[PDB]
Design an enzyme around this catalytic site. Structure first.
Site, PDB file in Angstrom:
ATOM      1  CG  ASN A  49      -2.609  -0.162   0.740  1.00 46.46           C
ATOM      2  OD1 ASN A  49      -3.170   0.276  -0.280  1.00 46.46           O
ATOM      3  ND2 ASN A  49      -2.672  -1.316   0.926  1.00 46.46           N
TER       4      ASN A  49
ATOM      5  CE1 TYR B 285       1.938   8.087   0.443  1.00 49.14           C
ATOM      6  CE2 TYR B 285       2.240   6.080  -0.876  1.00 49.14           C
ATOM      7  CZ  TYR B 285       0.958   7.290  -0.237  1.00 49.14           C
ATOM      8  OH  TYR B 285      -0.244   7.656  -0.708  1.00 49.14           O
TER       9      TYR B 285
ATOM     10  CD  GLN C  78       1.425   4.581   2.506  1.00 48.55           C
ATOM     11  OE1 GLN C  78       0.389   5.645   2.290  1.00 48.55           O
ATOM     12  NE2 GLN C  78       2.738   4.652   2.280  1.00 48.55           N
TER      13      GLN C  78
ATOM     14  CE  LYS D  26       1.216   7.251  10.317  1.00 50.44           C
ATOM     15  NZ  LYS D  26       1.591   8.485  10.559  1.00 50.44           N
TER      16      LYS D  26
ATOM     17  CG  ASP E 231      -2.643  15.861  12.699  1.00 44.52           C
ATOM     18  OD1 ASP E 231      -3.725  15.818  13.093  1.00 44.52           O
ATOM     19  OD2 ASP E 231      -2.588  14.725  12.385  1.00 44.52           O
TER      20      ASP E 231
END
Ligand SMILES: CCCCCC(=O)c1c(O)c(-c2ccc(O)cc2)c[nH]c1=O
Lengths: 281, 297
Positions: free
Chosen positions: B21, B24, B26, B42, B139
């Site tokens: 997938n 970068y 994922q 990650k 975030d």
């Protein structure tokens, strides 16, 4: 329409993600029966849009625009979002950003820049006459084939804002410019920044936080090339692309008639050198 | 198993699923090699120059212990490739999906008012732990708040201290998605320099509560460029419906103070009646437990 797009199984397969993120879910794919390569953009479907395809169908057949082949929908569980595959021409040599990145001294010879800038403007002309603004011209969206041909990818005009360094001042809302204008000339600014990116290896303000670059672009003078070695023709071309106020920015046609773009008595030899460079890597 | 260096993951962690997938950022399922326990990993392809940036900011990390409301960050690893290497950021696995998944798989994409107070409180508790340790999460959003199958609520932490998943890789130059951003992080006429603050997390938490109440953050309906322009210039956003209780509105008003200098701290917000007073707490915990079970079929 969308409901009539076949499953890709046995027709295209995915090989791997290309561009390591710059394009999102874009894979190197292969046409199963022939082994020909294709770039495949893969999206979860939930968004009659579905109009990205109609754009690509009508407007991609120009030689400076990567060709649209077709679309597929992959059957997914009860139960799960269906995937749509957009299948496009594969451009092997890669992006013009990558080219400059891999060149010694992170700079391309001025006549390579003239050749490439013209190819971009040619693709842009094709979009502009058909009333389409690319809206995201940058070296990462300008691609090279093995044939050393130049192709624009990723156009149309989502929820995430990309990189700001190639954005025109007018497309950035501010107190004085509340409704952020996309005009076809916005692409011409972006093309000039792409020309600086080819000359120096990075866009103006590359060393800023993206947010700070976004603040600065509308408030700054037009960027200029750092070195003095360039010809008066290139300075003038860059100057034309980067007219601060778009209302007096030359048109795409005009820039194509700019001496720097028009007088290229080296096309043949230049096109051969790019061929040479691509293979050497 | 240290957070102060980046090492080869050999014998410590490994991937359980195939990497198909992208690499970068994922996230893929993985395994602690010794214990066998699950881990979210990650994965980011990284240039040699970015590996140096990596070492630098590993020194910039701040120490903080485990917490029931933070998915534990386990550290940073690099795995070499045919002599571009891969960066791995390892985190506690949370099986039951994100809060965005929770709202998406709910009747009419709207959580009810006591689920909101509960999740919001959990978010706030994890933040307080980050904030007492001098770290801004940066975030907070539905998608970054996770459920375990035990219906525990946990914030995503892939090294939030130094923002490793954010500073390196082909899209670290991207502005990102504007909708959860506090006015002070957006560079504008009156804000020439983004100033990140702990209280920025609290604005995002208020936007997250609206995301739970309406299935989407304010301004979802316009070009992200336009929303970015609007966030510092609009009055504080509000809930659309009038159905919500007087306490919920007040809580939204508490978070969404535009000038961060005059926004409450995480502690002050933990004492907000909407968060403090949760009569049906036990009942919603099981209601959540229930929901997660039904969803996996
Ligand atoms: C082998 C390295 C070359 C990578 C090729 C590549 O990146 C390519 C693309 O990203 C795309 C591309 C297609 C759709 C899109 O919305 C964005 C990019 C098309 N063709 C390519 O060839």
């Amino acid at each position: 329409d969308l409901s009539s797009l076949r499953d890709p199984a046995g027709i295209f397969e995915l090989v791997e993600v290309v561009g390591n993120g710059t394009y999102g879910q874009v894979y190197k794919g292969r046409h199963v029966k022939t082994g020909q390569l294709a770039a495949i953009k893969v999206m979860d479907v939930t968004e009659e849009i579905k109009l990205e395809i109609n754009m690509l169908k009508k407007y991609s057949h120009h030689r400076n625009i990567a060709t649209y082949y077709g679309a597929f929908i992959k059957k997914s569980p009860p139960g799960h979002d269906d995937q749509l595959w957009l299948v496009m021409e594969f451009c092997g040599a890669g992006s013009i950003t990558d080219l400059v990145k891999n060149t010694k001294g992170n700079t391309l010879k001025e006549d390579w820049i003239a050749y490439i800038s013209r190819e971009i403007l040619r693709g842009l002309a094709h979009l502009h006459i058909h009333h389409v603004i690319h809206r995201d011209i940058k070296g990462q969206n300008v691609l090279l084939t093995e044939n050393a041909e130049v192709k624009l990818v990723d156009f149309g005009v989502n929820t995430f804002i990309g990189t700001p360094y190639w954005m025109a001042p007018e497309v950035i809302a501010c107190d004085e410019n509340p409704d952020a204008t996309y005009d076809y000339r916005s692409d011409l600014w972006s093309c000039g920044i792409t020309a600086i990116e080819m000359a120096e290896g990075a866009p103006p303000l590359c060393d800023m936080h993206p947010m700070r670059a976004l603040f600065l672009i509308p408030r700054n003078p037009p960027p200029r090339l750092k070195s003095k070695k360039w010809s008066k023709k290139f300075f003038s071309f860059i100057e034309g692309c980067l007219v601060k106020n778009y209302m007096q920015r030359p048109s795409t046609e005009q820039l194509l008639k700019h001496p720097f773009i028009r007088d290229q008595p080296n096309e043949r030899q230049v096109r051969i050198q790019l061929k040479d460079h691509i293979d050497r890597t």
